[PDB]
């Protein structure tokens, strides 16, 4: 609704809620890779970080033709 | 395009608006809250101590448009 998107990182754990009417498309980097996933509107997606990369990683998300991305390190 | 980019690294959290519109930042880390006014097109740069980095939220306000980053 009011929060579009929202972006938790924890511990390792990473949560994207997706507060839009359209699915959006997420993308993790840490370590040198990247992870990618698809979040469906009103879901919110839980990944695991392995550590030393706890405080290394960027999340990006893509709602149509918009992105915001959001990095911690 | 990139809209809103929120990145904390070194101790400081840079918010850059990538909208047509100025965006409202409000910074909550320690109890204590403020808030900014980021014009399009420009970049915002808060210190955050790394201390502060493990209970820390940055919330970006674009309209009626609300986004949250939590740190811990």
Known sequence: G????????????VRVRNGTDRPCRVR??????????????GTELEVELSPEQQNNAEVEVECGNEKYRFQLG
């Open 2 to 13: 009011h929060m579009r998107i929202e972006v938790r990182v924890d511990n390792g754990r």
């Open 28 to 41: 993790v980097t840490a370590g040198g890779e990247t992870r990618e996933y698809t979040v469906n509107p």
